[PDB]
Amino acid sequence: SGFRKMAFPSGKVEGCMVQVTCGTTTLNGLWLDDVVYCPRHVICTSEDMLNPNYEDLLIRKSNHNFLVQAGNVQLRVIGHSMQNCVLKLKVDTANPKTPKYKFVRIQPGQTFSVLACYNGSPSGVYQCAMRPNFTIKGSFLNGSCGSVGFNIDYDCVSFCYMHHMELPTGVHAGTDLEGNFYGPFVDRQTAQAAGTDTTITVNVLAWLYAAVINGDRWFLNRFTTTLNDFNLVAMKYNYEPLTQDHVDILGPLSAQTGIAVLDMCASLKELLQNGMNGRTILGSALLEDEFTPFDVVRQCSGVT
Amino acid sequence: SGFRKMAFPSGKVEGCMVQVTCGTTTLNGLWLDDVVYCPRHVICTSEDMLNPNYEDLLIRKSNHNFLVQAGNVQLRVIGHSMQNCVLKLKVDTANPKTPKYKFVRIQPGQTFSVLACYNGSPSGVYQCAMRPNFTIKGSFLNGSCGSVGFNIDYDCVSFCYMHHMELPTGVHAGTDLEGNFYGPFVDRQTAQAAGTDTTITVNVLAWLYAAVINGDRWFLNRFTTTLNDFNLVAMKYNYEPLTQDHVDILGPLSAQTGIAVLDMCASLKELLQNGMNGRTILGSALLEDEFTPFDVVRQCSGVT
Ligand SMILES: *CC(=O)N1Cc2ccccc2[C@@H](c2cccc(C)c2)C1
Ligand SMILES: *CC(=O)N1Cc2ccccc2[C@@H](c2cccc(C)c2)C1
């Protein structure tokens, strides 16, 4: 028992991190097979970030201008191309530690682990969620760009995020591994504001099921609700609307605990209306929304 | 910017995890050099756990009864000994992935990362703290025993914990890598209750400094306090007493922010007395105590 905000083991991703330097800018790269993926703003100076024309800036860059170092050894760059907001640097050596992998573009509400790196070296690993406004709340300082987000299914690493920037409010924006930003963000030092950071309702419900499985049951009430009634309350509290697809995904958790999804929705409704009253659920004084129903099942069953 | 509960990159520890089976019990082992470390209760049946005499149970075990599997390959056990509550299984092959390592016995309040494993395979990584009552609040199911806690300083892994058991209240107990339990716990299926889980005051203050560094400043007040005055309030709220050693350790954070330690103590005092009033600090509605002053410095500076 016990329920923790758990990240995937980072080993498979650590074996892929490299340092990429272009001129005076150093960030992180992801080395998979004979390609190193990194944010295209590695070619920019801080001054260029104000209004960069990446195709124009890239004309002045040759293969030998991208310095790629894996550990303490230099990789030879034999090609380079820009795909959306990422650069793909073809190297002459396939990464011997390349795991089985996929590039996936996740949906808001989905969680993933981030291996934060500086100068191609891992500093730490934590669990994130793609927010409903397409930002993430990470921990990223200067030099962290190029750090990646991922999920693992047994031996296959699905890369879903690459860090590119911090908004003026301290929230983070980045791309999938094809270089497409999540949300409307652009890789430019311009004021870009995030939309409403709503709460991932299906994730809160999943975490309420994890709480019941682990002994925290004080919040269970004598009520039930309907999707429409619940959603009127959810809208009022800036919670994402709950759909029948979300109810379906919670099915296994509902089955394991014997608590119908709509009954858990009514418990959540009373928690929103009445508050926690100084109490905690799984050591938290707020409703946690960065565990998906799949994460709850995985952690509660011990998937390796 | 942004502040996350971050675990160390787990790669170096993943390369050490093995499966240890004795009879019908399977748990995790830590393979360092030519020795595999695992909880001595691997020799027990669930029935034996009620009142086990480990020396007696061990007489019936030979080297060939301990089945050690690293990945999908079997290791040959050429020796075995009991050191306190851990078994040391001498194998004929040194672990080729053994990192630089130390065995450290940590103090309450110190944090570490846990790589939770099942059948020698890693399922996830999370950050823990050794509580003041010598328990940890982990996420451990049956099969997780033998999973280890650790800290990393650049390339040296300091192993500090090995998981052995869950108390009837769902909190966890284990040993250092010499087999000595943290606290008064014994590896027996007997009712053992934990003492008061007090709050790690120095860690809360460190996290309040991290909040200020990251923009969360609403809680800063116009007051100051003394160690004795603060401690009268801390005792009332089941917080650990703050010492001049703790004040000294917070010095770098006090210097970076320009907020004197005793001024932050007064802010903490008002937070304890007045509550959060529905507000959050670094996305938490309660005062976080599982970041040490060293963790705050490390994360805020990007140590790899
Ligand atoms: C993520 C990171 O480390 N940086 C540092 C950096 C170096 C060189 C150019 C730009 C940057 C930063 C930046 C600023 C404004 C916009 C974007 C997309 C990145 C991020
Ligand atoms: C940590 C873990 O997986 N287990 C399972 C287990 C297998 C075999 C014998 C005992 C145990 C469990 C246990 C029960 C009571 C006390 C202690 C020290 C361990 C823990």
XYZ file of C-alpha atoms and ligand atoms in Angstrom:
648
model
C 0.000 0.000 0.000
C 0.867 3.730 -0.169
C 0.408 5.959 -3.208
C 3.208 8.105 -4.604
C 3.744 10.513 -7.490
C 5.946 8.107 -9.355
C 8.058 8.663 -12.425
C 9.149 5.926 -14.841
C 12.650 4.474 -14.290
C 14.832 6.907 -16.313
C 17.754 4.631 -17.299
C 16.628 4.006 -20.898
C 16.304 7.765 -21.455
C 19.577 8.633 -19.614
C 21.435 6.524 -22.215
C 20.072 8.876 -24.924
C 20.989 12.293 -23.510
C 23.666 14.303 -25.246
C 24.921 17.883 -25.138
C 24.349 20.002 -28.272
C 26.260 23.266 -28.739
C 25.850 25.713 -31.576
C 28.048 28.778 -31.231
C 27.561 30.047 -27.687
C 24.303 28.152 -26.926
C 24.373 24.789 -25.179
C 21.264 22.674 -24.640
C 20.260 18.975 -24.474
C 19.767 16.574 -27.352
C 18.105 13.182 -27.580
C 20.232 10.612 -29.455
C 18.155 7.777 -30.969
C 19.714 5.526 -33.626
C 21.962 7.859 -35.738
C 19.881 11.010 -35.156
C 20.175 13.651 -32.410
C 16.942 15.629 -31.791
C 17.154 19.058 -30.173
C 15.189 22.396 -30.074
C 15.907 24.481 -33.193
C 16.597 27.541 -30.960
C 20.088 26.032 -30.258
C 21.119 28.157 -33.317
C 19.925 31.389 -31.626
C 21.634 33.929 -29.444
C 19.361 35.411 -26.645
C 19.085 38.487 -28.969
C 17.871 36.285 -31.880
C 15.046 34.917 -29.648
C 13.184 38.236 -29.847
C 12.075 37.627 -33.449
C 13.999 34.674 -34.967
C 13.724 33.653 -38.632
C 14.938 30.085 -38.163
C 15.287 29.211 -41.879
C 17.455 32.321 -42.351
C 19.521 31.672 -39.214
C 19.995 28.045 -40.300
C 21.530 29.026 -43.688
C 24.618 30.271 -41.765
C 24.997 26.871 -39.976
C 26.882 23.868 -41.327
C 27.177 20.269 -39.930
C 30.494 21.205 -38.234
C 28.832 24.091 -36.303
C 26.692 21.643 -34.247
C 28.902 20.221 -31.498
C 27.444 16.990 -30.146
C 29.005 15.376 -27.125
C 27.797 12.053 -25.613
C 29.476 11.603 -22.233
C 33.011 12.857 -22.831
C 33.152 11.839 -26.527
C 32.336 13.915 -29.600
C 29.889 12.674 -32.245
C 30.461 13.465 -35.912
C 27.568 15.397 -37.508
C 27.062 14.266 -41.140
C 23.702 15.956 -41.806
C 21.160 18.368 -40.348
C 17.580 19.319 -41.014
C 14.787 21.288 -39.432
C 11.458 19.580 -38.790
C 8.954 22.105 -37.370
C 10.646 23.400 -34.108
C 13.283 20.661 -33.749
C 16.595 20.061 -35.447
C 17.542 16.532 -36.464
C 21.286 16.079 -36.496
C 22.433 13.019 -38.411
C 25.487 11.570 -36.712
C 27.847 8.884 -38.113
C 27.312 6.555 -35.091
C 24.093 4.867 -34.023
C 23.496 5.230 -30.259
C 24.422 1.806 -28.881
C 22.047 2.386 -25.944
C 19.015 3.214 -28.191
C 15.981 1.544 -26.552
C 12.844 0.412 -28.452
C 10.989 3.674 -28.998
C 8.041 5.529 -30.487
C 7.256 9.226 -30.910
C 3.779 9.959 -29.577
C 1.769 13.182 -29.451
C -0.181 13.083 -26.200
C -3.561 14.648 -25.329
C -4.175 17.110 -22.456
C -4.633 15.269 -19.157
C -2.060 12.610 -20.084
C 0.861 12.249 -17.706
C 4.539 11.521 -18.442
C 7.973 11.584 -16.808
C 10.573 14.278 -17.478
C 14.284 13.632 -17.211
C 15.618 17.161 -16.532
C 19.123 17.565 -17.987
C 21.832 20.255 -18.135
C 24.795 19.999 -20.579
C 23.548 16.535 -21.643
C 23.666 15.237 -18.055
C 20.619 14.132 -16.064
C 19.890 16.036 -12.876
C 16.540 14.480 -11.930
C 13.280 12.822 -12.863
C 9.697 13.877 -12.076
C 6.138 13.228 -13.158
C 4.202 15.853 -15.204
C 0.834 16.120 -16.892
C 0.034 17.912 -20.141
C -2.333 20.578 -18.782
C -5.704 21.338 -20.501
C -4.155 24.699 -21.648
C -1.182 22.694 -23.230
C 1.417 23.905 -20.770
C 3.259 21.734 -18.230
C 4.364 22.771 -14.755
C 7.914 21.488 -14.739
C 11.181 22.366 -13.072
C 13.422 23.795 -15.785
C 16.290 26.299 -15.507
C 18.428 27.772 -18.353
C 20.268 24.920 -20.076
C 17.329 22.481 -19.556
C 15.887 22.874 -23.107
C 16.034 19.632 -25.014
C 15.113 17.631 -21.854
C 12.395 15.124 -22.796
C 9.103 13.756 -21.439
C 8.236 10.104 -21.931
C 6.180 7.057 -20.962
C 7.443 3.430 -20.922
C 5.459 0.295 -21.783
C 7.711 -2.587 -20.538
C 10.735 -2.016 -22.871
C 9.396 0.589 -25.353
C 9.997 4.269 -24.534
C 7.302 6.540 -26.034
C 8.777 10.055 -26.210
C 6.061 12.698 -26.022
C 7.659 15.985 -25.050
C 10.771 18.051 -25.532
C 11.254 21.180 -23.458
C 11.618 24.465 -25.376
C 10.528 27.354 -23.190
C 9.186 29.036 -20.109
C 6.292 31.478 -20.344
C 6.535 34.773 -18.382
C 4.317 33.181 -15.691
C 6.786 30.328 -15.006
C 4.814 27.552 -16.698
C 6.431 25.537 -19.482
C 5.907 24.942 -23.190
C 7.409 22.453 -25.607
C 6.916 20.180 -28.537
C 6.351 16.521 -29.381
C 9.393 14.745 -31.024
C 8.221 15.833 -34.499
C 8.826 19.476 -33.389
C 5.160 20.494 -33.133
C 4.367 22.594 -30.067
C 1.659 21.504 -27.720
C -0.910 24.303 -27.823
C -0.523 27.665 -29.536
C 2.987 28.471 -28.347
C 5.824 29.586 -30.628
C 9.587 29.424 -29.965
C 10.022 33.172 -29.661
C 10.837 35.531 -26.692
C 7.472 37.171 -26.948
C 4.750 37.458 -24.318
C 2.524 34.427 -24.719
C -0.136 33.881 -22.099
C -1.631 30.532 -21.208
C -5.373 29.905 -21.107
C -7.328 28.566 -18.124
C -5.561 25.809 -16.290
C -8.580 23.656 -15.614
C -8.476 20.569 -13.390
C -8.261 17.132 -15.109
C -11.513 15.671 -13.680
C -10.968 12.053 -14.836
C -7.513 12.143 -13.158
C -8.935 13.463 -9.874
C -11.507 10.609 -9.899
C -8.735 8.079 -10.628
C -6.747 9.482 -7.645
C -9.909 9.287 -5.443
C -10.134 5.564 -6.392
C -6.381 5.159 -5.478
C -7.167 6.796 -2.107
C -10.003 4.299 -1.407
C -7.762 1.338 -2.419
C -5.134 2.681 0.035
C -7.424 3.322 3.023
C -8.377 6.994 2.706
C -12.183 6.749 2.669
C -13.439 9.699 4.813
C -14.684 11.585 1.722
C -17.009 8.793 0.498
C -20.580 10.017 0.874
C -24.147 8.655 0.675
C -24.846 10.404 -2.659
C -24.824 9.808 -6.373
C -25.090 12.201 -9.350
C -25.518 12.195 -13.160
C -22.924 13.280 -15.776
C -24.952 16.433 -16.536
C -25.459 17.350 -12.848
C -21.799 16.656 -12.064
C -20.682 18.741 -15.067
C -22.697 21.788 -13.931
C -20.589 21.676 -10.690
C -17.379 20.879 -12.617
C -17.859 23.931 -14.912
C -18.332 26.174 -11.835
C -15.046 24.941 -10.304
C -12.986 25.094 -13.565
C -12.869 21.310 -13.851
C -12.806 19.658 -17.270
C -16.215 18.262 -18.349
C -16.549 14.529 -17.645
C -17.572 12.415 -20.645
C -18.870 8.834 -21.010
C -15.363 8.039 -22.467
C -13.892 9.111 -19.080
C -16.506 6.990 -17.202
C -15.534 4.002 -19.429
C -11.819 4.466 -18.675
C -12.570 4.484 -14.906
C -14.488 1.152 -15.227
C -11.657 -1.087 -13.917
C -11.210 1.155 -10.847
C -14.957 1.195 -10.249
C -14.953 -2.639 -10.510
C -12.033 -3.166 -8.144
C -13.480 -0.915 -5.432
C -17.191 -1.572 -5.983
C -17.826 2.192 -6.074
C -19.824 3.246 -9.151
C -18.208 6.074 -11.158
C -21.187 8.386 -10.637
C -21.021 7.761 -6.875
C -17.344 8.843 -6.892
C -18.443 11.882 -8.966
C -20.907 12.774 -6.157
C -18.097 12.470 -3.579
C -15.966 14.775 -5.746
C -18.924 17.194 -6.075
C -19.250 17.417 -2.245
C -15.464 17.889 -1.925
C -15.623 20.789 -4.389
C -18.628 22.380 -2.628
C -17.599 21.730 1.014
C -13.806 21.776 0.729
C -11.397 19.459 2.564
C -12.161 21.085 6.010
C -8.476 20.831 7.019
C -8.313 17.120 6.100
C -6.009 15.319 3.648
C -6.386 12.585 0.970
C -3.226 10.541 0.263
C -1.201 13.211 2.130
C -2.515 16.037 -0.054
C -4.714 18.996 1.039
C -5.891 19.539 -2.562
C -7.421 17.273 -5.228
C -4.540 15.746 -7.215
C -5.034 15.620 -11.005
C -1.666 14.378 -12.305
C -2.454 10.622 -12.093
C -4.348 9.087 -15.019
C -6.672 6.087 -14.490
C -3.910 4.014 -16.182
C -1.255 5.330 -13.735
C -3.497 4.381 -10.782
C -3.995 0.839 -12.150
C -0.258 0.513 -12.959
C 0.894 1.633 -9.501
C -1.759 -0.325 -7.645
C -0.840 -3.558 -9.545
C 2.973 -3.167 -9.816
C 3.534 -3.155 -13.599
C 7.273 -3.265 -14.412
C 11.817 28.236 -12.702
C 9.234 25.792 -11.271
C 9.794 23.488 -8.306
C 9.104 19.760 -8.462
C 9.380 16.743 -6.174
C 12.293 15.317 -8.070
C 13.941 11.943 -7.766
C 17.530 11.173 -8.791
C 18.010 9.643 -12.270
C 17.584 5.894 -11.539
C 19.754 4.354 -14.297
C 22.772 3.561 -12.089
C 20.498 1.749 -9.622
C 18.433 -0.023 -12.350
C 21.665 -1.729 -13.493
C 21.950 -3.273 -9.992
C 18.480 -4.777 -9.528
C 18.132 -8.532 -9.505
C 15.443 -11.038 -8.559
C 16.153 -13.260 -5.526
C 14.060 -16.388 -4.925
C 14.321 -18.723 -1.978
C 11.787 -21.537 -2.076
C 8.426 -19.923 -2.791
C 9.403 -16.318 -1.874
C 10.576 -13.886 -4.535
C 11.857 -10.402 -3.729
C 14.427 -7.876 -5.047
C 18.176 -7.915 -4.564
C 20.834 -5.269 -5.069
C 23.874 -6.571 -6.994
C 27.056 -4.564 -6.292
C 30.443 -6.019 -7.273
C 30.149 -9.816 -6.597
C 27.596 -9.495 -3.772
C 23.778 -9.496 -3.926
C 22.093 -7.787 -0.928
C 18.506 -8.688 -0.064
C 16.153 -8.791 3.013
C 16.814 -11.908 5.117
C 13.036 -12.655 5.155
C 13.451 -14.073 1.581
C 14.026 -17.401 3.459
C 10.597 -17.170 5.167
C 7.177 -18.427 4.244
C 4.273 -16.030 5.252
C 3.720 -18.484 8.186
C 7.385 -18.119 9.294
C 6.936 -14.298 9.470
C 4.800 -14.621 12.610
C 7.808 -15.435 14.814
C 10.882 -16.227 12.657
C 14.187 -17.476 14.093
C 16.343 -16.433 11.146
C 19.549 -18.224 12.248
C 17.556 -21.465 12.591
C 15.724 -20.991 9.282
C 19.047 -20.209 7.577
C 20.643 -23.536 8.662
C 18.260 -25.309 6.221
C 19.413 -23.058 3.304
C 22.407 -23.710 1.067
C 23.981 -21.512 -1.704
C 21.966 -23.423 -4.358
C 18.639 -22.571 -2.619
C 19.049 -18.827 -3.403
C 18.032 -18.299 -7.030
C 19.461 -15.046 -8.360
C 18.422 -13.823 -11.765
C 19.791 -10.621 -13.396
C 17.666 -9.837 -16.448
C 17.018 -13.255 -17.973
C 20.323 -14.818 -16.811
C 21.033 -16.814 -13.660
C 23.886 -15.879 -11.315
C 25.860 -18.577 -9.520
C 25.740 -18.251 -5.708
C 29.112 -19.269 -4.184
C 28.537 -18.010 -0.624
C 25.922 -16.557 1.712
C 25.883 -14.797 5.038
C 23.509 -12.893 7.256
C 24.440 -9.388 8.378
C 21.768 -8.035 10.765
C 18.480 -8.134 8.676
C 20.053 -8.550 5.221
C 21.509 -11.521 3.414
C 24.689 -11.087 1.395
C 24.852 -13.561 -1.447
C 28.318 -13.957 -2.924
C 28.013 -14.568 -6.645
C 30.793 -15.734 -9.024
C 30.365 -12.683 -11.338
C 30.978 -9.042 -10.489
C 28.114 -6.812 -11.708
C 29.546 -5.155 -14.821
C 27.193 -2.193 -14.280
C 28.323 -1.594 -10.635
C 28.515 2.205 -10.183
C 30.803 3.973 -7.659
C 28.950 3.489 -4.386
C 28.814 3.946 -0.629
C 26.512 2.562 2.064
C 25.227 5.397 4.235
C 22.938 5.395 7.269
C 20.830 8.536 7.003
C 19.269 10.673 9.765
C 15.534 11.470 10.090
C 14.560 14.383 7.844
C 16.980 13.302 5.101
C 15.431 12.635 1.713
C 16.285 9.966 -0.885
C 14.930 8.345 -4.047
C 13.352 4.886 -4.129
C 13.445 2.681 -7.193
C 10.389 0.442 -6.607
C 10.949 -3.007 -8.140
C 9.003 -6.270 -8.553
C 10.751 -9.544 -9.574
C 14.025 -7.599 -10.001
C 12.435 -5.197 -12.506
C 11.977 -1.467 -11.920
C 8.426 -0.163 -11.959
C 9.036 3.446 -10.891
C 11.029 6.053 -9.027
C 9.901 8.529 -6.349
C 11.294 10.801 -3.674
C 10.949 9.885 0.050
C 12.103 11.277 3.366
C 13.137 9.309 6.443
C 10.402 10.467 8.836
C 11.227 11.615 12.428
C 9.558 8.343 13.663
C 11.949 6.329 11.299
C 9.238 5.201 8.922
C 8.919 6.231 5.262
C 5.695 6.782 3.346
C 6.426 4.858 0.182
C 4.474 2.994 -2.453
C 5.245 -0.691 -1.954
C 3.126 -3.756 -2.784
C 3.963 -7.459 -2.126
C 7.111 -8.345 -4.071
C 8.629 -4.841 -3.546
C 10.904 -5.858 -0.607
C 14.542 -5.452 -1.484
C 13.803 -2.207 -3.422
C 16.381 0.405 -2.379
C 16.567 4.100 -1.451
C 19.557 6.161 -2.520
C 21.151 9.554 -3.149
C 23.647 10.365 -5.954
C 26.581 12.788 -5.792
C 27.655 13.178 -9.482
C 28.733 9.533 -10.166
C 28.678 7.973 -6.658
C 25.451 6.259 -5.548
C 25.013 6.336 -1.743
C 22.559 3.555 -0.847
C 20.675 4.359 2.348
C 17.575 2.198 2.481
C 16.288 -1.235 1.620
C 12.582 -1.951 1.916
C 11.565 -4.745 4.315
C 8.030 -4.168 5.530
C 4.740 -2.380 5.856
C 3.304 -1.578 9.275
C -0.428 -2.257 9.880
C -1.068 1.476 9.290
C 0.366 1.404 5.735
C 3.625 3.216 6.481
C 6.930 1.543 5.645
C 9.973 0.249 7.499
C 13.366 -0.929 6.318
C 17.060 -1.055 6.892
C 20.287 0.610 5.779
C 22.554 -1.593 3.518
C 24.267 -3.086 6.595
C 20.864 -4.631 7.543
C 20.137 -2.359 10.517
C 16.534 -1.165 10.684
C 15.801 2.504 10.868
C 14.002 2.978 14.183
C 12.785 0.237 16.506
C 11.208 -2.017 13.896
C 11.871 -5.754 13.603
C 11.340 -8.014 10.564
C 8.434 -9.910 12.077
C 4.635 -10.034 11.302
C 3.810 -8.533 14.640
C 1.897 -5.348 15.418
C 4.447 -2.559 15.580
C 3.132 0.965 15.884
C 4.969 4.058 14.741
C 5.528 7.071 16.982
C 4.490 10.651 16.199
C 5.086 11.638 12.627
C 6.295 15.147 13.282
C 6.935 17.677 10.511
C 10.577 18.223 9.395
C 10.777 21.972 10.210
C 14.139 22.662 8.492
C 12.732 21.037 5.308
C 9.563 23.158 5.400
C 11.740 26.308 5.716
C 13.919 25.128 2.805
C 10.735 24.621 0.701
C 9.487 28.120 1.742
C 12.816 29.517 0.408
C 12.282 27.510 -2.874
C 8.795 29.075 -3.102
C 10.224 32.627 -2.767
C 12.933 31.878 -5.395
C 10.131 30.665 -7.721
C 7.695 33.566 -7.234
C 5.346 32.368 -4.489
C 5.732 35.176 -1.936
C 2.190 35.821 -0.552
C 3.069 34.211 2.808
C 6.028 36.526 3.566
C 5.066 38.699 6.523
C 6.350 41.772 8.401
C 7.470 39.707 11.426
C 10.492 38.023 12.901
C 10.882 35.537 15.787
C 13.573 33.847 17.933
C 14.503 30.121 17.957
C 12.886 29.699 21.397
C 9.677 31.567 20.442
C 9.445 29.692 17.137
C 10.005 26.350 18.907
C 7.136 26.963 21.363
C 4.846 27.211 18.256
C 6.606 24.284 16.528
C 6.059 22.002 19.577
C 2.331 22.907 19.591
C 1.979 21.941 15.902
C 4.051 18.692 16.124
C 6.943 20.222 14.197
C 10.509 19.154 14.947
C 12.425 21.668 17.124
C 14.610 24.015 15.059
C 18.266 24.157 16.123
C 21.137 26.558 15.330
C 22.552 23.665 13.168
C 19.347 23.892 11.056
C 19.673 27.728 10.862
C 23.314 27.260 9.696
C 22.274 24.790 6.974
C 19.661 27.294 5.680
C 22.354 30.045 5.430
C 22.896 29.756 1.640
C 19.128 30.003 1.012
C 18.863 32.969 3.365
C 21.779 34.615 1.478
C 20.358 34.020 -1.989
C 16.926 35.424 -1.114
C 17.960 38.086 1.406
C 15.372 36.738 3.867
C 16.871 36.058 7.312
C 16.180 32.537 8.637
C 14.312 33.857 11.681
C 12.117 36.002 9.412
C 11.179 32.867 7.414
C 10.517 31.148 10.783
C 8.036 33.961 11.611
C 6.313 33.451 8.234
C 6.082 29.723 9.003
C 4.731 30.531 12.501
C 1.909 32.669 10.986
C 1.164 29.918 8.430
C 0.828 27.388 11.258
C -1.391 29.712 13.339
C -3.526 31.191 10.510
C -3.544 28.315 8.019
C -3.293 28.640 4.228
C -6.826 30.234 3.942
C -7.530 28.254 0.741
C -4.250 29.385 -0.872
C -1.363 27.296 -2.238
C 2.478 27.435 -2.108
C 4.276 25.764 -5.047
C 0.968 24.055 -5.970
C 0.545 22.530 -2.509
C -2.222 23.292 0.049
C -0.032 21.990 2.906
C 3.523 22.740 4.083
C 5.861 20.355 2.232
C 8.627 18.778 4.351
C 10.258 16.275 1.975
C 12.825 18.698 0.454
C 16.059 19.229 2.395
C 17.940 22.560 2.192
C 20.467 20.670 -0.006
C 17.687 19.448 -2.362
C 16.408 23.036 -2.724
C 19.913 24.324 -3.568
C 20.530 21.387 -5.961
C 17.257 21.857 -7.859
C 17.482 25.634 -7.930
C 21.073 25.489 -9.346
C 20.797 22.446 -11.677
C 23.408 20.057 -10.227
C 23.873 17.017 -12.505
C 15.301 26.000 -22.150
C 16.571 26.811 -22.074
O 17.535 26.399 -21.468
N 16.563 28.031 -22.654
C 17.811 28.827 -22.697
C 18.040 29.457 -24.047
C 19.285 29.490 -24.674
C 19.438 30.121 -25.897
C 18.354 30.704 -26.511
C 17.112 30.673 -25.899
C 16.946 30.062 -24.657
C 15.633 30.080 -23.913
C 14.447 30.578 -24.729
C 14.042 31.902 -24.627
C 12.904 32.339 -25.278
C 12.168 31.455 -26.048
C 12.567 30.131 -26.195
C 11.836 29.203 -27.131
C 13.704 29.707 -25.519
C 15.393 28.739 -23.204
C 8.034 -6.396 0.977
C 7.342 -7.638 0.477
O 7.164 -7.815 -0.708
N 6.878 -8.505 1.403
C 6.280 -9.788 0.968
C 6.764 -10.952 1.794
C 7.119 -12.184 1.245
C 7.517 -13.228 2.062
C 7.583 -13.049 3.424
C 7.238 -11.828 3.979
C 6.813 -10.774 3.172
C 6.343 -9.456 3.739
C 6.617 -9.270 5.226
C 5.622 -9.545 6.154
C 5.820 -9.279 7.495
C 7.025 -8.747 7.921
C 8.053 -8.491 7.019
C 9.405 -8.028 7.499
C 7.827 -8.749 5.673
C 6.815 -8.289 2.860
